[PDB]
Structure formats: structure tokens, C-alpha cells
Design a protein around this ligand. Structure first.
Ligand code: CL
Ligand code: CL
Ligand code: MG
Ligand code: MG
Ligand code: MG
Ligand code: MG
Ligand code: MG
Ligand code: MG
Ligand code: MG
Ligand code: MG
Ligand code: MG
Ligand code: MG
Ligand code: MG
Ligand code: MG
Ligand code: MG
Ligand code: MG
Lengths: 220, 171, 51, 185, 159, 55
RNA sequence: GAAAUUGUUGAAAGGGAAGGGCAUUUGAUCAGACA
RNA sequence: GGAAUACUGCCAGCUGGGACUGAGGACUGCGACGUAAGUCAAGGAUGCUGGCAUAAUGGUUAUAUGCCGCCCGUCUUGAAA
RNA sequence: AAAUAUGUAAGAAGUCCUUGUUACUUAAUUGAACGUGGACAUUUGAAUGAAGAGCUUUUAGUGGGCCAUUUUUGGUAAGC
RNA sequence: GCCCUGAAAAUGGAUGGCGCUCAAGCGUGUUACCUAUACUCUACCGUCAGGGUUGAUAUGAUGCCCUGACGAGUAGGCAGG
């Protein structure tokens, strides 16, 4: 068993990497085509004298910006159900009616918006950890992802990213597998003298939409 | 902040009884689009029976100054709340763009009347096309032919703690 | 024993994501877009510049 | 700061080892610790946990209870396993020819099993015969028949025994126990 | 001293509705209740017999007993830090059938019909309710709907 | 010397430490309080169907 | 033949208390490897 | 009519300077570059060189300097009081 | 006649088809209750989370409280 | 709006002090910068949880080892010394 089993294992690894290579190529063209179609749709509507209304965002990223002292019970429970138990923790949330009302209850304690592909990729690559047997395991290899999410068809870190940004049938399982992200304070500061006002009123909490990408990247 | 002017177009949510509701547009001065959409619903709820939950935003576009390197005289109509009562006010501002004139307007209201951003409504900003239609003396004095004025008592900034000669304020 | 961040350690960047080699070789991060020539209708421009 | 959803540094609350200092009991625990780790057989894990139980949690199992279990359909040729003491029962007059593995046998219980042609073996002999617990029946004695249980949960309208030293006419049968004296419970 | 009688603080709770006094309509007495039915409690002020206590006003329970002119209802009541089971003997005037499941039984019937219908054609019959989803993309035309500009109004008294 | 009379302060927090137990549901609930005439016949109905399956 | 308390000798500091914590300067004093 | 630039965003583009850290201790894993043999920044620092080998580093102790430090115990809603 | 709070439901202890028991009930195998046998598996009936859930015994201290935002009573008011 | 009159208390006196007048004051806007026992990464101690390992010829299977998370505390409880 010195060279027969090892050769078979190496051959299997070669096949697995080929499958991942083709999937990542297919994901790249899927992202590129979708982005160009949206851009061209806006131009066509303007040329015809109409307005193209983009579909509402289906994914948000929520960051807790408030400490753990002096929190009313109902908002405190909602933060626990979103796995935000310490300051500068973040999770992804699928956007439905049942989850929009949850965000309204915790507005003065969090900052959330609409993440982009670049933000999602950097979060998973640098601070992506998996919950395996109630333990926080770093995602340093594709095998540990396949061993835990393979039954859902996810067998690489890019497949996990694909399931997140495009909210797929197995978003709940893929998202819950990821450990809540542990972020630091922003490198260049928060940009405001006082955080605990709404973003509209010059504060930090609430929904800042696409501006969440600049905040998260400085905290990542 | 540094203001930008956006156009925001909105509508009520279409239903089976009234498909294709009417489109409403207004021009908003704001530092970013998130605030601009918030201000849109603030004024729409003062004019029509609608709110954000029962409506939607159709399009938001930034509006640039057509001639940003031309000096213009602006007339501004504002409504603001003081410590007791609400008042209407007309002021005139000289600048090269609408966003620049609006920035001066907010600074002027805060300085002279202690009115914050939340207490001010910008009713209308319009360029005064013709001379002699300017009705404020603090603007008319800059509209004289061959205007010249010196800058007496120049003060120079020093980069060192100590200077080895008495300074001069000539200019 | 020691987590190594991809996107700064290239060897780790190649362990995961075998497509990273193809992405860099083809300069997909600086892909030029096809040129179009659609122009907005007159109603759009008049509304934008309307008082 | 962390907003904990549960108590920190909480012990499991289950015994992981025997409380006793019996040298021979620790040898049995060592044997079945190895078996439970490297056999993936549910029988071995059950036996290992049963060895940690205290005296009240290991009630005696009589030979009559053993005989009744062997009357189950298809269980006539199974090995009865008792992690505890097997006691004698004279209320039964017929005993089968089974094989019983137990920690302890009383003098009466061992005599009756041998008289009927059966054998009494220890738990380590069982491991050699059935490393994965093939053809085994685990029997447990009654826990709620203990005399201390009948006083648990005492209160109005609960029907529990009171904690009392002397029982008789003048001991807690007056007011509070009959309608003729104030009220009834 | 304080007063804590049986019908304390029920001045408005047990009143009849406006222009709805008088005798009880006969459909109240013609309804049939069975053990296991879900009913909700609302006392009627004109019937002083078999009347529930004010705590159970607006509560919902399950029938456990049926008698001549009354039924037995089970109510879970929170006392201290746990819930206790309460049994009530109420005349039929004070109860009615709860509609909290009559619209759920029809979904059960609909699920079975949809499951059987798609059994011969398509897998993934998709019989789970979903919350409201974000709106999809759309195109809004300005043909006959040119946007109208609005501006804030000046202050006026008009008193 | 007058003192405090009554307050519910901190009582909800004490109740939520371990309490607010949802009552457990058992199959075959007790027949306490059921009409005695129904119970007498249901006893005979259960006895009769026992013989039908036994025989 | 301990402590409180006291004498002599020696060293050190002291502008309305003294004592303490973290860090280093200065003085005095000292263990460890020379493989 | 044809460009440029500003603003915002992306790059699995390249590259210079500074600081803190070196846990682990035969081999085993996943990869990279190679026709191959092999090599490598790939499951945690190695290579080269100088001075000194003693109070030099360091410990202890006294003192000085910067900042900080209210008297313990007890009853109490609350103690330097 | 709100806002905030508040009860119940969202399945296997479920649904459907067939027909057994009784001293109850019906003009009446009519019904009621409990069953025999058959048909439908976990996109098996909304969302999110779940340092796993359930359960028992035993015993310490405590039973003078006070403060802040908001609601609120007595009082001219109060660090009442 | 700012400023002034209205505006009288007992030891000497307090935007914290000095002092400050296109402020070092008041209203408002844009950036840079300073620093918590908080956040991020690493080491070490302990606690809890989930696991690996009885094979002799070398000694502790209450042993050795792998992985993850956690750490305020009067009255009071328990555990190891
Ligand atoms: Cl706080
Ligand atoms: Cl209190
Ligand atoms: Mg900086
Ligand atoms: Mg700040
Ligand atoms: Mg009466
Ligand atoms: Mg009291
Ligand atoms: Mg002597
Ligand atoms: Mg002495
Ligand atoms: Mg030194
Ligand atoms: Mg001090
Ligand atoms: Mg006192
Ligand atoms: Mg004290
Ligand atoms: Mg007392
Ligand atoms: Mg200022
Ligand atoms: Mg810190
Ligand atoms: Mg502690």
C-alpha cells in the first residue's frame, strides 16, 4: 500500500479540481452576463422614453455596532436570533417580509446594506469559518466544505460564495454553516462624530444600502 | 455636507383598479442618494395620500449644472420654523452653480437665524436672468461696471514659531 | 496551525480556486466592454432638465 | 463583551466514571471503555454508562423477572445481562435454562440458576463471548418502588405519603384529613 | 378598602353592543360542538348563568366535555413562571366556533389535491407557504404619463 | 416607620430565568370532569371491543 | 532570648504628613553558563 | 459634432518604506512550477556575521523623576466621612 | 375608535376510504366515543435561531431597597 | 438671531485653571489627528465541551495527546490545594 492507493487518491484529486475549474468558469460568465444585461436594460428603457425599475435587493449584510449593555428585551432577542452577540459581528440575511420586520426592531443597534460580489468574496476568503460539530473551523481547504455541504451540491469555496450572492434553494443551509463573521473596527474610522444616530441624520445605524461595502471592507 | 441635486420620480403601487398610476417628480438637494430618497417621501407625504410602504421609486438621477463656470444671480424662496412660528423668506445668492448657492443658503440660515437643516424647506431656486430684477442691496453692489477693490491689511501665515523681523501687512 | 490569508499568499490562492490561474492570464479583471450607441429619447432629456 | 445565550463553563451533569474506589470495577470500566471506542456497537456504550450508576440507580433484578423476560416471543435463547445484583425469588417454581451475566449473584440466585442447568458468568466473560453484544437482553429493576420515592412531591391533593415516624390513630388523621374536622386536604 | 369582587372592573366588557340588546338569535343554540373543537370565549351580558370569569374573555380553548346546555373548555393559564390547565363550564351563548383553523383545514385539503395532481407529471410539488418576496424588475412607460413636478408649499394660516 | 407597599419590579426577569414552561401535551388526556353517563357506557364499549380483537 | 519600644555606629532622603502602583535612571548588592 | 477630465466602483495588476510576532519540532496533507529527475514562499524561521564571557544583560534593594493612589473593619439605598 | 401590548392555529397525537364494540343516544345502525384493516414521507405543510432536549431530589442566602427615560396619582412645590 | 436693560446677600473664588475678542465665544459644514480592561490577530494560564490512543521491551489510561469556545462579581453554594 505504498504506491497503489496513493496513486488512486491523487487521480481522484485531479478529477475533483477539474470539476471545480469548470464550475468557476461557468460562474464567471454568469456574473458577467447578468451585470451587462442590467446595464443594457437601463439604456434600452431610456432610449424608448421609459424607466427601467431594477428588482429589489434579495440579500443584506448586517453588522452590529452597539455594545451588550442596556438593551431592551425584544431587540435583544432579535439580535440573538440573527447570531449577532457581540459588537462588530456580521451575518448575511435573506430579504423577505418575515425578515424585514426583524430589521426594523433592531435599527438603532446595527448597520446594514446591500453587499457586492467583491465584498462577499473577501469576507469568505479572509474571515470565513465553518461550524463543524459545534466548532469554529477555518475554511483553509475545499475538502472540509465538500464534507459538510456536499449533499447540497456545494463542493468548493466559490460554490459557497455563489449560493450566497445568488440566493439559491440551499441558502439557509449554506448561510447557517458559516460562523458569524468577527470584524474589527474600521481602519479609517466611522466617518462621523457620533455613530448612534441614523445614517440619514449623519449617524451610523440603519440601512445605508450600497454604502455598506465601503464600511465592511475597512472593517475586514 | 457638499450637496448634490437629484431628480426623484415616484408612483403609487399599481393595482388592478388603477394600473399605471401617475408619476410625480421633484428636485432634491442632498449629499447622497440614500438621503435624497428619504427626503422625497418626506415631501410627498405632505402633498398626497401615499407613503413608502404603499409606493415605489421609479428613477433617481443626478442633475449637473449646465454652465458650471458662469457667474449667476440666484433667487431663493425658503420656508423655515423658528423657535416660535413658521415664516417665509426670500434671499438672493451669487454663485456659479445651484448646489453652491444652496450650500451658502444653509450656512446663512444657521448663522443668522440659528435654523438647522431639519427646520428648512427649499421652496424654489431660480436664476435671475436680468439685471435690475435683483432686489437686495448686498448683491447689487457687485453688479457695477469695472468693479475694483483692494485687500487692506494682509496677514501672512508663518510656518515657524519665531520670526527675526517685524512683519508687514502691505498688499 | 496557522491560518494564511488568500489574495495575499498566492500559493494558498491557487490551492483553493484553480480558476485563479486562468483569471490572471486573460486579464479578466480589466475586460473591455463592447461599445454601444443607444441615445435617450427626447422625453427623458426634457424631464431631467425640467424645473 | 459577549451576550451569552447560555450559562458558561457548565458541566455535562452525567457521570463519566464510577464514584467507587473498587479496583475490580475500574478494570471492567477500562475493558468496556476500549470496547465502546472501537466497536461502534450500541450495546457496549449502554453497558459502560450503566457501570457508572449509583446504588439507587441499579435496583436488584430477581430471577422471576428474568424468567418472565425469557417468555417473550423469540427471546428464549438470549443472554440476560444485568449490570447490578441478581436476587433470588421463591415465589416462582419453574426456571428455564438460560445464561445470565451480572455483576453480582446472591447465594440463592446462583443456586437456582445452576440447579436448572444454566450458568452464571461475569461481564468480562460476556465480552469474550459477545464483543458486540450479540443475542443479549438488558434488564433493569424498578426505580420508583423505592421507599423514599413515595414521599416526593408531597402537597395538597397530591396523594403522597407524609414523612412520619409513628403511624396510628393519633398521628396525622385529624383536621386536614377529614371533612368532620375542618376540611379534607 | 379595596374591592375585588367576581365581576369587578367589567363595566364595559360585559355590555351589549349598540342597538344589539334583547334576545339571542336562534342560530346560537343550533350549532353543534364536539370534543376536540376549538372555541373562543366571549361572555354575553344578558345571560347570567354559565358566565365565564373576566380573565377568560377573548381566550381560545379546546372542548373536552359536552352537557345538556353547556360545554367544557380547557384553557392554559400562566401562573407565576409556568402555565396551568384550567377547565371551564360555559353555556353555549358565551362561545362560538373559532375560525383560526377553518381556513387551515382547506389548505390541508388543497395540499392533498395538489400533491396527487402533480404525482403523475412533475416532482417537487411545492406545497409550502412563502412570505412576501421582493418585487421583480419592471418597465414604467411615460406614454400619457409624463411626470409632474411638485414643490413644497409656503406657510399659510387660513384660520 | 413607613415602608414600600407593593411593586412588580424585577418579577418578570425572575420568571424568565428558568420559567415560562409551555405545558406538555400527553396522548390520552385524563377523563376528569367528563359526564358520568358517557363514562359508564364508554367503559362497557371498551370492554366489548377487547373481546372482539382477543377472540 | 522574638515583637512593641530604645541607645550607639553606618548608609540614604526630607519647601504644610508619611506610606503605595506601573516604568526606567543612579548607587549598593547578588545567583545562573563558561562545555 | 468629437474627445478629455472630475466623481464613484472593480482588478485572482505591479512595486517601495516602517513596526510587532517566530507558537510547533522525524515523516504523513492540499497545492505550485517542471518532458522528466526534482524543486518551492505549499499543515508556524532560518541563513550569515560581530562584540563580550562579566556584574555587561538581568534579579533584589534604596533613592530620584512622570503619571496615578482618601482608612481599614462594620451596619446601610448610600462611608474618606 | 387607534398605536403599543394580548389569546389561538400553521399536521404522523395529520388527513382520507372501508367497517367493529356499547348498558349512552336516535322514529331508525341515527349519532357519539374508542378501535380493526387500507392509502399518503420528511419543500411532511411559513421565517429565523437552537453550547441538545426532557425530568427529579435536596439545600444556602434574601423577604429595609434605591436611581434614570417614558406613562402616572396626591401636593404650590421638594434631592417629597 | 446675537448683545444689552430688567438682574439684590452675607470668609476670598472659580466656563476645572490660566487665559481668550475676523476667539481659544455662538450656529453650521468638510477632513486630519489623540486614546479604554471594548473590537481584530498572535502567545501563555485556567475552565468547560467534543475526540484520538493498552501493543510489548521504559516508568504516571486519575496518563499522554488533538480540536473548539469561554474567563466581572457582594450575600451564598460547590471543588482542588
Ligand atoms: Cl451604556
Ligand atoms: Cl424596586
Ligand atoms: Mg491613523
Ligand atoms: Mg466619535
Ligand atoms: Mg342565581
Ligand atoms: Mg418591605
Ligand atoms: Mg538568658
Ligand atoms: Mg525590636
Ligand atoms: Mg540593568
Ligand atoms: Mg490624585
Ligand atoms: Mg441611614
Ligand atoms: Mg467604610
Ligand atoms: Mg431585616
Ligand atoms: Mg465652530
Ligand atoms: Mg482592549
Ligand atoms: Mg469569576
Amino acid at each position: 500500500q505504498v504506491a497503489a492507493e496513493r496513486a488512486a487518491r491523487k487521480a481522484a484529486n485531479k478529477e475533483k479540481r477539474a470539476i471545480i475549474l469548470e464550475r468557476n468558469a461557468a460562474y464567471q460568465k454568469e456574473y458577467e452576463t447578468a451585470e451587462r444585461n442590467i446595464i443594457q436594460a437601463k439604456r434600452d428603457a431610456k432610449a424608448a422614453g421609459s424607466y427601467y425599475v431594477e428588482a429589489q435587493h434579495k440579500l443584506v449584510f448586517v453588522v452590529r455596532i452597539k455594545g451588550i449593555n442596556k438593551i431592551p428585551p425584544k431587540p435583544r432577542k432579535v439580535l440573538q436570533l440573527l447570531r449577532l452577540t457581540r459588537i462588530n459581528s456580521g451575518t448575511f440575511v435573506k430579504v423577505t417580509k418575515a425578515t424585514l420586520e426583524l430589521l426594523k426592531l433592531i435599527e438603532p443597534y446595527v448597520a446594514y446594506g446591500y453587499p457586492s460580489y467583491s465584498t462577499i468574496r473577501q469576507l469568505v476568503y479572509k474571515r470565513g469559518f465553518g461550524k463543524i460539530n459545534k466548532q469554529r473551523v477555518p475554511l483553509s481547504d475545499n475538502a472540509i466544505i465538500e464534507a459538510n455541504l456536499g449533499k447540497y451540491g456545494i463542493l468548493s469555496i466559490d460554490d459557497l460564495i455563489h449560493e450566497i450572492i445568488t440566493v439559491g434553494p440551499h441558502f439557509k443551509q449554506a448561510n447557517n454553516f458559516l460562523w458569524p463573521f468577527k470584524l474589527s473596527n474600521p481602519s479609517g474610522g466611522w466617518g462621523v462624530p457620533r455613530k448612534f444616530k441614523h445614517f440619514i441624520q449623519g449617524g451610523s445605524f440603519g440601512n445605508r444600502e450600497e454604502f455598506i461595502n465601503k464600511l465592511v471592507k475597512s472593517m475586514n | 455636507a457638499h450637496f448634490k441635486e437629484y431628480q426623484v420620480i415616484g408612483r403609487r403601487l399599481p393595482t388592478e383598479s388603477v394600473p399605471e398610476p401617475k408619476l410625480f417628480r421633484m428636485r432634491i438637494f442632498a449629499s447622497n442618494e440614500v438621503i435624497a430618497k428619504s427626503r422625497y417621501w418626506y415631501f410627498l407625504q405632505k402633498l398626497h395620500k401615499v407613503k413608502k410602504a404603499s409606493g415605489e421609486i421609479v428613477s433617481i438621477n443626478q442633475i449637473n449644472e449646465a454652465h458650471p463656470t458662469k457667474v449667476k444671480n440666484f433667487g431663493v424662496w425658503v420656508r423655515y420654523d423658528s423657535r416660535s412660528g413658521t415664516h417665509n423668506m426670500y434671499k438672493e445668492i451669487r454663485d456659479v452653480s445651484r448646489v453652491a448657492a444652496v450650500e451658502t443658503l444653509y450656512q446663512d440660515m444657521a448663522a443668522r437665524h440659528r435654523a438647522r437643516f431639519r427646520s428648512i424647506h427649499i421652496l424654489k431656486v431660480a436664476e435671475i436672468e436680468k439685471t435690475a430684477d435683483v432686489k437686495r442691496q448686498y448683491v447689487k453692489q457687485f453688479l457695477t461696471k469695472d468693479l475694483k477693490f483692494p485687500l487692506p491689511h494682509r496677514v501672512q501665515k508663518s510656518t515657524k514659531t519665531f520670526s527675526y523681523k517685524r512683519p508687514s501687512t502691505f498688499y | 496551525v496557522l491560518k494564511k490569508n488568500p489574495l495575499k499568499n498566492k500559493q494558498v490562492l491557487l490551492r483553493l480556486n484553480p480558476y485563479a490561474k486562468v483569471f490572471a492570464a486573460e486579464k479578466l479583471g480589466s475586460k473591455k466592454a463592447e461599445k454601444t450607441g443607444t441615445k435617450p429619447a427626447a422625453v427623458f432629456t426634457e424631464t431631467l432638465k425640467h424645473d | 463583551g459577549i451576550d451569552h445565550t447560555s450559562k458558561q463553563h457548565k458541566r455535562s451533569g452525567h457521570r463519566t466514571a464510577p464514584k467507587s474506589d473498587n479496583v475490580y470495577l475500574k478494570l471492567l470500566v477500562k475493558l468496556y471503555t476500549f470496547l465502546a471506542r472501537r466497536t461502534d456497537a450500541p450495546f457496549n456504550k449502554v453497558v459502560l454508562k450503566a457501570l457508572f450508576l449509583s446504588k439507587i440507580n441499579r435496583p436488584p433484578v430477581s430471577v422471576s423477572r428474568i424468567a418472565r423476560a425469557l417468555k417473550q416471543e423469540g427471546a428464549a435463547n438470549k443472554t440476560v445481562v444485568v449490570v447490578g445484583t441478581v436476587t433470588d425469588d421463591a415465589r416462582i417454581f419453574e426456571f428455564p435454562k438460560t445464561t445470565v451475566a451480572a455483576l453480582r449473584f446472591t447465594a440463592g440466585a446462583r443456586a437456582k440458576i445452576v440447579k436448572a442447568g444454566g450458568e452464571c458468568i461475569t461481564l468480562d466473560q460476556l465480552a469474550v463471548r459477545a464483543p458486540k453484544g450479540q443475542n443479549t437482553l438488558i434488564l433493569r429493576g424498578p426505580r420508583n418502588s423505592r421507599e423514599a420515592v413515595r414521599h416526593f412531591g408531597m402537597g395538597p391533593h397530591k396523594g403522597k405519603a407524609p414523612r412520619i415516624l409513628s403511624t396510628g390513630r393519633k398521628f396525622e388523621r385529624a383536621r386536614g384529613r377529614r371533612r368532620s374536622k375542618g376540611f379534607k386536604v | 378598602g379595596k374591592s375585588h369582587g367576581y365581576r369587578s372592573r367589567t363595566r364595559y366588557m360585559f355590555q351589549r353592543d349598540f342597538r344589539k340588546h334583547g334576545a339571542v338569535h336562534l342560530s346560537t343554540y343550533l350549532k353543534v360542538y364536539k370534543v376536540g373543537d376549538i372555541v373562543d370565549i366571549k361572555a354575553n351580558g344578558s345571560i347570567q348563568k354559565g358566565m365565564p370569569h373576566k380573565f377568560y374573555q377573548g381566550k381560545t380553548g379546546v372542548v373536552y366535555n359536552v352537557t345538556k346546555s353547556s360545554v367544557g373548555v380547557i384553557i392554559n393559564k400562566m401562573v407565576g413562571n409556568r402555565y396551568l390547565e384550567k377547565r371551564l363550564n360555559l353555556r353555549v351563548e358565551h362561545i362560538k366556533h373559532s375560525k383560526c383553523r377553518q381556513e387551515f383545514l382547506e389548505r390541508v385539503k388543497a395540499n392533498a389535491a395538489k400533491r396527487a395532481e402533480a404525482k403523475a407529471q412533475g416532482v417537487a410539488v411545492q406545497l409550502k407557504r412563502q412570505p412576501a418576496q421582493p418585487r421583480e424588475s419592471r418597465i414604467v412607460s411615460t406614454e400619457g404619463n409624463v411626470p409632474q413636478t411638485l414643490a413644497p408649499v409656503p406657510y399659510e394660516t387660513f384660520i | 416607620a413607613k415602608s414600600k407597599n407593593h411593586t412588580a419590579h424585577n418579577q418578570t426577569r425572575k420568571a424568565h430565568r428558568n420559567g415560562i414552561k409551555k405545558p406538555k401535551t400527553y396522548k390520552y388526556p385524563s377523563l376528569k370532569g367528563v359526564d358520568p353517563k358517557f363514562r359508564r357506557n364508554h367503559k362497557h364499549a371498551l370492554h366489548g371491543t377487547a373481546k372482539a380483537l382477543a377472540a
